[PDB]
Design a protein around this nucleic acid. Sequence first.
RNA 1: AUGUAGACCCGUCCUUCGCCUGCGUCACGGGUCCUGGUUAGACGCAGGCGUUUUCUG
Lengths: 70, 67, 71, 71, 70, 68
Amino acid sequence: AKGQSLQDPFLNALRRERVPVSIYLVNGIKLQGQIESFDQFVILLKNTVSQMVYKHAISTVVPSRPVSHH
Amino acid sequence: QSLQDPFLNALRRERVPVSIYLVNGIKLQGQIESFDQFVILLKNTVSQMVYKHAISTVVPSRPVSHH
Amino acid sequence: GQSLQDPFLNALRRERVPVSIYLVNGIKLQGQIESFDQFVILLKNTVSQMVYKHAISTVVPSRPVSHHSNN
Amino acid sequence: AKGQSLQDPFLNALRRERVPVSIYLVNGIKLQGQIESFDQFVILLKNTVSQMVYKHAISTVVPSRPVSHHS
Amino acid sequence: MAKGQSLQDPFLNALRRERVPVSIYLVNGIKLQGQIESFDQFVILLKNTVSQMVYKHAISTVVPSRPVSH
Amino acid sequence: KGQSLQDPFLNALRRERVPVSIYLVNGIKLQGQIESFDQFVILLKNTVSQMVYKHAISTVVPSRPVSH
RNA sequence: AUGUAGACCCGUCCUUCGCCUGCGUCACGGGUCCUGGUUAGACGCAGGCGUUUUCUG
């Protein structure tokens, strides 16, 4: 089969369940918060404020607890 | 679904002071004067063009009003 | 349109080969490839973490793998 | 504000008015000179010599004076 | 002569075919070495002790040990 | 309506066999002559030909002045 | 003898975001070539819309 898209479902499940995540940027910096919303190119990450994070600056998104899409 | 643009227009319109962190760790500050698919014009003492491909994060001083 | 990237990654995933993923900033991740898409890889160790391919330099499998018996 | 509206008009105004600029690269290096000409993908920067700077390596272009321009 | 533009794939294919030992320098300064086993639009498979997959977007230069004739 | 100078500039350097320095994004300086080049790569000749990805280059600077 | 043709040559008349559409402009003298060869592009003006960089410029 087509091989199913895994970036938008994964992020959406984190967003919907308000899972706390750590976002590591390419320069080593670690952001934390909850995924508020996201778009093809950015992610809105909410902690004390909403900050807009470019996907092209992200290395990894690692959730506090396991999340499943199917 | 576009929110980069709704999120960046709102900061511009409201003249919200922002911090822009670059991929190399540098922190820029100012107000978003105007901003496009490939750059953002950031105004402090002078207007300086900033390439979006060099930005990691845009973080506003004061929360901006979104849905 | 053609790729050896998808064929190579899928074999690692299917066989549950332990891999090391080196990022562009020098950081080394390890785990098994759980799934992947055009733009990311899900890497499983203690938890599943999502790794952007544009942050990866190399994927190096822990144990060598088959040619796929290519003709 | 839609499409590439600010990417090339701003550069042209610098180029035409021979405004001295500073170009900061993504690795922290600071170049200075006058924009001589620009492609979609590069900028020619003139000081003692003309050097070709890839845009993908640039973080910011900051002019010496706010352009004596519409803005 | 005449041509289609690309020399990136002919150059790589010649190295692969001739089993030329190469050095691949990554954008972070790391030096990889081996032989080019195969490659696609986006990656190169580099063989030493094991076959590892190298993203082209991480590569700065490919420099062959000895002459390649295109 | 604009112009393309990236591929005229290179191609003048390659034709005139001008010495050049290519600075990479990581600070490394390569030197040589442009031999062949492409949408995404430049072939740089010194003791051997090496293939340099454009996406790794910050600047190309000629030893001697030339026209765009 | 060389064209009710064409492609080049010579001479005379301060580039810049893309794209769709509509309107116009790309001329005049002379020269070479027993001539793979093209159906498009460029500039002017009007109107409209705009991939938001997530795997090589």
